[PDB]
Amino acid sequence: EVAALVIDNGSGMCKAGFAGDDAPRAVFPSIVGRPRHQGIMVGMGQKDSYVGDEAQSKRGILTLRYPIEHGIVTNWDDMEKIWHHTFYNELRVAPEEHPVLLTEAPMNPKSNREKMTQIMFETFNVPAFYVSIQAVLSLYSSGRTTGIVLDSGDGVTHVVPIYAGFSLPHAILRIDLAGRDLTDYLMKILSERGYSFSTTAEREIVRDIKEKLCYVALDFEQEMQTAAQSSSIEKSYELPDGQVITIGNERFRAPEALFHPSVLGLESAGIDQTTYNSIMKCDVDVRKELYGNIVMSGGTTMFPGIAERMQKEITALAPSSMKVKIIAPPERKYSVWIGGSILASLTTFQQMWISKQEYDESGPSIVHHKCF
Amino acid sequence: MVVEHPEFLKAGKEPGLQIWRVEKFDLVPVPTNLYGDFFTGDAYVILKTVQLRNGNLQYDLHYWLGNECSQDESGAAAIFTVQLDDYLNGRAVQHREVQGFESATFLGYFKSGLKYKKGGVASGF
C-alpha cells in the first residue's frame, strides 16, 4: 500500500525516508533558519523560514536555530517547521496520506511525547502514528532482541540495556558529551597547535577533520609518545583554501574525551565505565547477555579503533570468565532509521499504529502505553 | 497482541515445533516436510512448544540468522520474535541462533541435523 514515513529526529541530523527503503532518502541538519531582515526579491531572503541544507548555505542572511537539544525537542514552533519541511519538501508527500513513525530519545519526558502526538494528529492530520526509542530500533537493526546499546550522537550519548525486546529504564544512563562537544574540542586543540578555526565554515572543516582523520587509541599513553618519537601517526589535511596541514596526535586526543570526559572539565564517567555501570544496575541473569551484546550506534561511535578500545576496557571491568563482545555495524550512523524502516514495514505492525480514531476518542496521553 | 496475523493465531497451540521464514517483511510458514532445511541467505523463526505437567505450555523461540541474510530479514526475525513472545503472553525464552553457532538445544530439534542451502528469498528492501 502506502508506505509509512520514518523520521529519526537527531539533535544534529534529521534522517527521513520511506519504510521499506534500506536507507534514509533525506539526511540533513536539524536547523531552522529565519531572515534577520526579510526581503522582497530573489536571493534577498523572501521566505519566512528555511530548513536544513538551505538554511545552512544561506548562513550570511539567516539566524539559525536547533529545536532539538540532547535528543529532546525544546522549541516546538521550530520543530513543526522542520517536520513540515521534511514531509512537503524532503519526502515530498502530504502527511495526511501516510502512517508516520517518529523516534525519540531514551527518557524523553511524557509531556514532550504527548505534544509530538498532538502535533502529528492535529496539525499534520496523520492517519496513523507511532513513536520508537532510538536505541531499541538500533538493536533490532543489528538482529537482536537483547543487548546494551551505546548511542553517541551529536547532542547526547545514552547507554540503554535491553532485554528480550524491552529496555530497562532504571538502568539507562546518559553521558552529556557527544559529537558536538568533540568537534568543539578538536577545534580547541587544533587551535593550540597554531592554527585557526572559529567561524562555522572553519568549524565545519574541523568536523571534517574529526570524521576523517580522528581515531580512538588502544592505549592512550603509549600512543601519545609514539607520535612524540615518530611522524608515523601524522596525516596531512588539505584545507579548502589549498593550504595543507598536518594533524598529529590531536587525531586520538579528541575522541579520548569519550573515555575521560574530565578533559572537558566534565565530571562524568566515560563511555566504557558508564556501560559497565549500566550493566551493573541490571539483574544478574541479564548481565551475561548484555556483556556479550554491546551494540554501538550513532555517528560519534564511528571513530576507528573505538570497538577495539571498548572491548579491552570492558573486558577489564567484567569478570574474567565473561565473554565480552562489541558490535559496531558499519551503517551505525543510520541504524536507528533502518530499524524504524524494518519495523514499520512488518505485516504484523499494521495493527500497532495509533489510529486517528483512537486519538480522537482518547487524546494524546494514549501514546505512552500504545508505544510501550 | 493487538497483532492480527494468521500465523500468530496458529502459534504454539499444541506441543511440537513450528518454523517460519521471514519473506519480505512477512512471517511465512515453512512446509513441515522441509523442516531442517535452512537457506543461508535467509532468516527464520522457530517455536518449540512443550506440554507442562500442570497443563501450561512452555515455549522456546529461536530466531535463526543465515550467514548471508540481509538486514531486513535478521531485523524482522528479531522483531517477530519479540512480537510472538508478547502474543504468547511472554511465556517463551528467546534464543538468537547464528549459522555456525547454533545451540545444542536448537540442533536437538532436528533428528537428521540441519541442511544448509545457499541462496534464499530476496531482501524486502
Ligand SMILES: Nc1ncnc2c1ncn2[C@@H]1O[C@H](COP(=O)(O)OP(=O)(O)OP(=O)(O)O)[C@@H](O)[C@H]1O
Ligand atoms: N565518521 C565519523 N567519525 C566521527 N564522528 C562522526 C562521523 N560521522 C559523523 N560523525 C559525528 O556524529 C554526530 C552526528 O551523529 P548522529 O547522526 O548519530 O547524531 P544525532 O542523531 O543527530 O544526535 P543525537 O542522537 O544526540 O540526537 C556529529 O557530531 C558528527 O560530526
Ligand SMILES: [Ca+2]
Ligand atoms: Ca534472503
Ligand SMILES: [Mg+2]
Ligand atoms: Mg540520534
